[PDB]
Design a protein around this ligand. Structure first.
Ligand SMILES: C/N=C(/NC)NCCC[C@H](N)C(=O)O
Length: 304
């Protein structure tokens, strides 16, 4: 089995670099954030432009959906996160506390908490209802590139340019694990596997690694792409074959067989760095997005 992802839609509208794309958990929508200070909403299946959500004062590095698909959270260079009601476009809360660019964010599965990571080297945990910061974790000694909750929300994983991935207990704020990788190259992205047993980490030595984070063992290594400068999203694709999906600094989307580590497809079409990819929750659809010289988002579909 290889997949046969083919380009179906190209989504144009952002006027600066796209930073993040994410499918809604209900599969209906794609949300995009950009250096143009905007969030856009698009139809997940047809790429149809839906609406623009605005209000940040500087560029946005990340956006993320609540579990019920009703809210977004965005992370901005203006040092804030904003919580958005997607249907009305309202800014429900502005989360203030970080002392530098907010880079990454996510809801927990219950979606009563938001985790954020910042250039201020901290990870912050927030109450969605009140907008109050509940915990500030002294997480890293360099900017925080990613933060993600596990499947039951009891753990947080963070990555940083300091070369570390750390595992945090959500309830206590305690650091439970530090993962150490030879020569400590900057970690540019991390997330949990859908089942929560592993983490997938990207490092700025053109490498993705799948870790058993409890045992602290590297189980798989994926290479062949280019990633030495930018924080590029990576994904588990689970709707068809079991793949790993990433952007790349050679303007391609890469797809690997998870088990064998072989490159099974490379998707051509973008004209600048592919900074973000996302995988649709029930259908074999990949969304990708590119930097300043391209500015477009692409929807690719496969039969497996
Ligand atoms: C939140 N996570 C990201 N990547 C993992 N964001 C995209 C990179 C944004 C960065 N300012 C840039 O333009 O490179």
């Amino acid at each position: 089995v290889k997949p046969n992802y083919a380009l179906k839609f190209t989504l144009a509208g952002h006027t600066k670099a796209v930073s993040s794309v994410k499918f809604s958990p209900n599969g209906e929508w794609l949300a995009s954030s950009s250096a143009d200070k905007l969030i856009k909403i698009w139809g997940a299946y047809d790429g149809k432009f839906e609406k623009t959500i605005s209000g940040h004062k500087l560029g946005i590095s990340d956006v993320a959906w609540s579990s019920d698909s009703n809210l977004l959270v965005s992370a901005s260079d203006d040092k804030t996160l904003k919580i958005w009601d997607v249907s009305s476009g309202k800014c429900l809360k502005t989360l203030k506390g970080h002392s530098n660019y907010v880079f990454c964010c996510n809801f927990n599965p219950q979606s009563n908490l938001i985790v954020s990571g910042s250039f201020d080297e901290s990870v912050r945990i927030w109450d969605v209802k009140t907008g109050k910061c509940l915990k500030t974790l002294p997480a890293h000694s360099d900017p925080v590139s990613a933060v993600h909750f596990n499947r039951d929300g009891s753990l947080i994983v963070s990555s940083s340019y300091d070369g570390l991935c750390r595992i945090w207990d959500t309830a206590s704020g305690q650091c439970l694990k530090t993962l150490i990788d030879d020569d400590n190259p900057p970690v540019s992205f991390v997330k949990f596997s859908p089942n929560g047993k592993y983490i997938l980490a990207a490092t700025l030595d053109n490498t993705l690694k799948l870790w058993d984070y409890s045992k602290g063992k590297c189980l798989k290594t994926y290479t062949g792409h280019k990633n030495e400068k930018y924080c590029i999203f990576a994904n588990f694709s689970v709707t068809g074959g079991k793949w790993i999906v990433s952007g790349s600094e050679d303007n391609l989307v890469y797809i690997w067989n998870l088990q064998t580590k072989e490159i099974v497809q490379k998707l051509q079409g973008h004209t600048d760095v592919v900074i973000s990819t996302a995988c649709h929750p029930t259908e074999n659809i990949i969304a990708s997005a590119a930097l300043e010289n391209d500015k477009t988002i692409k929807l690719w579909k496969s039969d497996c």
